Design an enzyme around this catalytic site. Structure first.
Site, PDB file in Angstrom:
ATOM      1  N   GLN A  39     -13.757  15.325  25.792  1.00 56.99           N
ATOM      2  CA  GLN A  39     -13.110  14.031  25.646  1.00 56.99           C
ATOM      3  C   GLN A  39     -13.519  13.072  26.762  1.00 56.99           C
ATOM      4  OE1 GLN A  39      -9.090  15.639  24.936  1.00 56.99           O
ATOM      5  NE2 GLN A  39      -8.702  13.849  23.641  1.00 56.99           N
ATOM      6  N   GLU A  40     -13.340  11.781  26.487  1.00 58.73           N
ATOM      7  CA  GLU A  40     -13.640  10.712  27.440  1.00 58.73           C
ATOM      8  C   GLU A  40     -15.040  10.863  28.027  1.00 58.73           C
ATOM      9  OE1 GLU A  40     -12.352   7.928  28.346  1.00 58.73           O
ATOM     10  OE2 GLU A  40     -10.359   7.947  27.431  1.00 58.73           O
ATOM     11  N   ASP A  41     -16.005  11.096  27.141  1.00 57.48           N
ATOM     12  CA  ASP A  41     -17.429  11.060  27.451  1.00 57.48           C
ATOM     13  C   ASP A  41     -17.875  12.184  28.384  1.00 57.48           C
ATOM     14  OD1 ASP A  41     -17.335   8.832  25.859  1.00 57.48           O
ATOM     15  OD2 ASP A  41     -17.452   7.389  27.510  1.00 57.48           O
ATOM     16  N   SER A  42     -17.104  13.264  28.480  1.00 53.98           N
ATOM     17  CA  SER A  42     -17.574  14.505  29.073  1.00 53.98           C
ATOM     18  C   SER A  42     -18.031  15.436  27.948  1.00 53.98           C
ATOM     19  CB  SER A  42     -16.488  15.135  29.946  1.00 53.98           C
ATOM     20  OG  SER A  42     -15.238  15.136  29.284  1.00 53.98           O
TER      21      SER A  42
END
Ligand SMILES: [Zn+2]
Ligand SMILES: [Zn+2]
Ligand SMILES: [Zn+2]
Lengths: 114, 34, 43, 263, 65, 125
Positions: free
Chosen positions: F2-5
């Site tokens: 999530q959140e670009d990880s």
């Protein structure tokens, strides 16, 4: 660094019992067994072969967290019918199912040769 | 062409890798007629 | 003990003895592994 | 025949196709998982390096040696190094290997999987043999030496499963599929014009009969007949990959009984 | 940097197929994808495992000690 | 992820994916001090609070030796210490030690320490 040693995914520690039975105080005739050092290999398997237990009410499991190889399994059964037995009757059902697969693969396998 | 004058040994056949590891300057030389 | 690059020979002298190569003529000089069998995980 | 039936489609030394009739998916998957990770296998675990003059660093050559396959047919008669009673390792939990390599030839000298010899006793059980499937019978290419490079090390193999590290992974890839015609609605296809035409019918499509358009989808249908195919890196033959997959999952559900009666 | 023993996302052994793949094009002179295909690499994670790899060790063993 | 990880396949890391090598290059030299009095590399008898023991008696560590924390990779004397400890933040394995001299003739030292970095939860890609 802070990474746990790989083997803690299956090797128990000091005193940890593989299974730990706790009584679901919420709904009566229900129990929650904390399987240590296991995952959806066993988790999803036991839950499914419990759903088929006619006298079984609830059957679910959650892997508390992907870090820690362990899952809680909640089981509820008809009155009196001990859920601990519902797990045994479900387990042997799996092994007896498994054992027949082995022997049905071994014979089917022992035939073909290419 | 780049050489280095070290403490005893005088004219060293100085190369890039040489000076790179030994921590020397890749220095050529200046000479002119007065 | 010590070594060299261009010549790739086993100079290997002791200490305080003019940091220089045997025949060669350039001061390379490595150091060479300890005979101590070092262990490694296979991951 | 006895419940969970099988049917072999193809089979070879590497791959093995088979259909599982009348079986629970939640179970079949759990076997796929067991096959992948939790099947016992041997491979290098500790590499003592006496001399390494290669362009590859120590642990870089180490990292792979374990990644190399080792014989593991009769692995069940070699105790886990951690479960045995010896200081460090021994012959009843480890298989010592030695790999000595000097490059005389001016032409570059390759170090291979074959080039490792065992300096322990096997006790007449298949183990430690560098599985060589090579065409020219050379094995896995570990290194390359020049005119005077050298490499002296000693590998101590140990029992292990892919969970500890996937170099004990006896299986390669596990082809999993069921219900080729999406009759069970277990996936909502994606399209910008036609769902059927944009998605190719799978190979395992001739085995189930097509859906027959003019029909009302029967919720009562459930997952059945699973189209599989298990590959063997070598460590264990493709029968035991599935036989011990079936059999070590057995022991899982059975040890759950073991502690069940201790309560 | 030398052939990766065993493919990353499969486990498939591919450390042995270097000097075979390489000679499937030097000798037999085949299409790379058809060579990979003849070396038994149906799944593309293996295909990339050999295809994308550059064997830099060869440019390493050029120096002296 | 999530959140670009992102989620990394540990199985594929174990098989070698995105495994890095790392190198560090500590340096030191024997300084010259006027009246030809100079420093010297050697195991001494002030001392640094770390483990000198991994040194040799020439004030050096030989390659292929594991090292951790504030271990000494270079002993020097100006008794009067100038030993070079390992980076307080790294845990490596000695790779290659070099000894030559300066354009002043100073005994010159470069220690190289090797570590393999392994894709960890938190690493950037
Ligand atoms: Zn020399
Ligand atoms: Zn032992
Ligand atoms: Zn692959």
């Amino acid at each position: 660094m802070n990474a746990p040693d790989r083997f803690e995914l299956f090797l128990l520690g000091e005193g940890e019992s593989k299974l730990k039975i706790d009584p679901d105080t919420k709904a009566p005739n229900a129990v929650v067994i904390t399987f240590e050092k296991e995952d959806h290999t066993l988790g999803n398997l036991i839950r499914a072969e419990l759903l088929n237990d006619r006298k079984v009410l609830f059957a679910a499991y959650k892997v508390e967290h992907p870090f820690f190889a362990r899952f809680k399994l909640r089981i509820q059964t008809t009155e009196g019918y001990d859920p601990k037995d519902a797990l045994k009757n479900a387990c042997n059902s799996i092994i007896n199912k498994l054992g027949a697969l082995k022997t049905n693969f071994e014979t089917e396998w022992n035939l073909q040769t290419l | 062409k780049p050489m280095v004058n070290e403490s005893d040994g005088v004219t060293h056949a100085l190369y890039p890798q040489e000076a790179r590891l030994r921590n020397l300057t890749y220095s050529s030389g200046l000479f002119v007629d007065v | 003990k010590y070594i060299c690059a261009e010549c790739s020979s086993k100079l290997s002298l002791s200490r305080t003895d003019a940091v220089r190569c045997k025949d060669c003529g350039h001061r390379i000089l490595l150091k060479a592994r300890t005979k101590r069998l070092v262990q490694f995980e296979a991951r | 025949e006895e419940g969970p039936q099988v049917k072999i489609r193809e089979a070879s030394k590497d791959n093995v196709d088979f259909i599982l009739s009348n079986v629970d998916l939640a179970m079949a998957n759990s076997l796929r998982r067991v096959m992948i990770a939790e099947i016992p296998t041997l491979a290098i675990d500790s590499v003592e390096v006496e001399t390494n003059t290669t362009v590859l660093a120590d642990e870089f050559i180490a990292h792979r040696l374990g990644l190399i396959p080792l014989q593991s047919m009769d692995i069940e008669q070699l105790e886990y190094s951690r479960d045995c009673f010896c200081e460090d390792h021994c012959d009843k939990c480890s298989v010592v290997l030695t790999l000595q390599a000097f490059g005389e030839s001016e032409s570059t000298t390759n170090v291979y999987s074959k080039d490792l010899v065992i300096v322990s006793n096997l006790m007449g059980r298949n183990i430690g043999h560098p599985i060589i499937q090579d065409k020219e019978g050379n094995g896995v290419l570990i290194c390359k030496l020049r005119k005077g490079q050298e490499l002296k090390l000693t590998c101590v193999a140990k029992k292990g499963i892919a969970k500890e590290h996937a170099k004990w992974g006896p299986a390669a890839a596990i082809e999993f599929e069921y219900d080729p015609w999406n009759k069970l609605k277990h996936t909502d296809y994606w399209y910008e014009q036609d769902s059927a035409k944009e998605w190719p019918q799978s190979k395992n499509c001739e085995y189930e009969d097509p859906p027959n358009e003019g029909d009302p989808f029967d919720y009562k249908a459930q997952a059945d007949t699973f189209y599989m195919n298990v590959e063997s890196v070598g460590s264990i033959p493709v029968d035991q990959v599935v036989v011990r997959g079936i059999d070590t999952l057995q022991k899982k559900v059975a040890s759950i009984l073991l502690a069940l009666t201790q309560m | 940097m030398i052939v990766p023993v065993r493919c990353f996302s499969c486990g498939k052994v591919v450390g042995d197929k270097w000097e075979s793949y390489l000679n499937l094009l030097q000798e037999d002179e085949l299409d790379e994808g058809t060579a990979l295909s003849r070396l038994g690499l149906k799944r593309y994670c293996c295909r990339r495992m050999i295809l994308t790899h550059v064997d830099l060790i060869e440019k390493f063993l050029r120096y002296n000690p | 992820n999530q959140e670009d990880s992102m989620i990394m396949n540990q199985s594929s890391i174990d098989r070698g994916l995105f495994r890095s090598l790392f190198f560090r290059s500590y340096m030191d030299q024997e300084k010259k001090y006027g009246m030809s009095i100079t420093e010297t590399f050697e195991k001494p008898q002030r001392m640094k609070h770390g483990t000198y023991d991994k040194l040799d008696d020439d004030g050096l560590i030989a390659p292929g030796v594991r090292v951790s924390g504030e271990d000494v990779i270079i002993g020097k004397t100006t008794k009067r210490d100038a030993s070079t400890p390992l980076r307080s933040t790294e845990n490596g394995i000695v790779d290659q030690v070099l000894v030559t001299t300066n354009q002043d003739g100073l005994k010159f030292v470069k220690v190289r320490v090797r570590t393999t970095k392994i894709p960890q939860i938190g690493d950037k890609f």
